[PDB]
Amino acid sequence: MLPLPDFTATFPEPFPAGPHSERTEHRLLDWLEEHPLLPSAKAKAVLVNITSHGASRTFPTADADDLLLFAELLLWLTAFDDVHAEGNGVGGPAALVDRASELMLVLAGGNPPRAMSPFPAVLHDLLARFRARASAAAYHRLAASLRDTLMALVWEAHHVAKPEGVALATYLAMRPHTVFIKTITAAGEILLGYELTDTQRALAAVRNLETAVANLAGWINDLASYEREMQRGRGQPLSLPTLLHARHGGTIEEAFTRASSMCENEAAVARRGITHLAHASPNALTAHARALEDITRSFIWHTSHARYQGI
Amino acid sequence: MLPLPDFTATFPEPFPAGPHSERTEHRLLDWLEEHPLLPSAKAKAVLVNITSHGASRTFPTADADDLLLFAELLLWLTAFDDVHAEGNGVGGPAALVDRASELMLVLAGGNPPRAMSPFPAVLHDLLARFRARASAAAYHRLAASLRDTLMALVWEAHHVAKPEGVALATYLAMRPHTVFIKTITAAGEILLGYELTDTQRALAAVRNLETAVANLAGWINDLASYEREMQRGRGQPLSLPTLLHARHGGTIEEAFTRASSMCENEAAVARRGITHLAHASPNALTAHARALEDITRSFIWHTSHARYQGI
Ligand SMILES: [Mg+2]
Ligand SMILES: [Mg+2]
Ligand SMILES: [Mg+2]
Ligand SMILES: [Mg+2]
Ligand SMILES: [Mg+2]
Ligand SMILES: [Mg+2]
């Protein structure tokens, strides 16, 4: 069972998906035969599916080409998380640090030594295509979001063995960086062809909406992933219900009820923020509100995927 | 003894120091009583001295105010390295990861939870003053350089216990990030009031000079710091002579001879690169060549300081 959040009042189904979902899924499989990032063909098929079909919901406006770019970056990042991070790879946190440091060198520019992992070179190519498409500031924001995620995955890898050693407030601030929401949005500004001034980014209305969408994305993933993340060998995962259970005692069921209330409140904040920003102003504050709405709908959609709940 | 590199033909003494060296040293001590980053008053005095007097050589053009900003950032970063990183702090690599993750949150923007270390809040204030002074792209480059350094300090902390487990080529690519040269230069573009186009940064002449200055800064620090870094309890440090000694066998003296040859060659490359770029073009390629020359002279200067060789 486990109580789950109900978004009917804030983000009702269905979530619009754009056209190019099945082509993207095929062009992603051709790309991956050219750059094998996943060991298993089974794992590859599930991840290619949720990425392509999820990307259709994240950016319904699209362009079959722009969509494939974003889908390739998101699959690259998720595959890296799944192969190396969260303790999935051997060698402990130290091996992830070595892999993350190679990627930092790609991000810093100026040809680093060749790596025997394929992830650095793919990232190099992906960043090249995004740099050509984005403004200078927009690329920098994409690159920053990725640098921050790498530090946060290193952080997570040092705490998965003892999730109870993490304070709830630290987890809530770190989780937006491990759920990739900042990279998704920075990629969205590029591909949807808009960009906010640094003064607009400082607006409370803009920050409060971005915070609520980041919280909601991480928390719903935590709830949707808890059973799968649990069925592995290790104990409780480093995630929201585990920390609420440690904080309040009681049962996991009551932790999920608490988390589900947290998520519904956060969805209400996000809905109200989308309405404020969409009620016109600069066209950049709209479009951004609409970009964040579709990103949010796609995160709610992907919790029903096989990657999380099987059948 | 230990053979050391001779830069007389490439970067002869003396190195010009600007005027405001002693005021900066006093204004730094007043700042630190307001924000204690160093435990000891002895440690504080040495570090304030080399930072203020070194900063006078790094940016002779100056402005007593602009100089104090840069000096505060460089002292903040060096104090963080000295207190938490390279194994100086207890709790192993994991404690440094937690401290670095707090700083990543400062860099990402949007108020993280309050930390009980003072380093995050000082960084928050320092970044605020640099954002007001720099262009949007220039601030982003400063912030990126700092993100990259944090990952590289985390990397170093995972390898100091077994320096021989590091390949020479990996160390050479990582060391520019732990010697802080990229932050120094990005701060210089801001404070000297210039900035390169992304196409200029791609010029071979610009990249080859930046690489040679980064190599030289890290390597001369390695050689100057080897005796001090050795006199601690642990064995050989994670640094150039240690890795050359492991690569070639032989003696530490022959490793230092090899490293000294590497440094003199690199200084010759840097000198030739400074001449090419200074021979006019856009005024931005000059000034940059001159900025890098002064940065390089300051790194050579600071190897004679008490922080490295005592008396
Ligand atoms: Mg993860
Ligand atoms: Mg996962
Ligand atoms: Mg999950
Ligand atoms: Mg160091
Ligand atoms: Mg040191
Ligand atoms: Mg040193």
TrEMBL record, chains A, B:
Any GO molecular function: terpene synthase activity
Annotated residues for binding of Mg(2+) 1: 81-82, 86
InterPro entries: Isoprenoid_synthase_dom_sf, Terpene_cyclase-like_2
Keyword set, alphabetical order: Lyase, Metal-binding
Positions contributing to Mg(2+) 2 binding: 81, 86, 156
This enzyme's EC code(s): 4.2.3.-
Keyword rRNA-binding carried by entry: no
UniProt-recorded name of the protein: Labdane-related diterpene synthase
Organism: Streptomyces sp
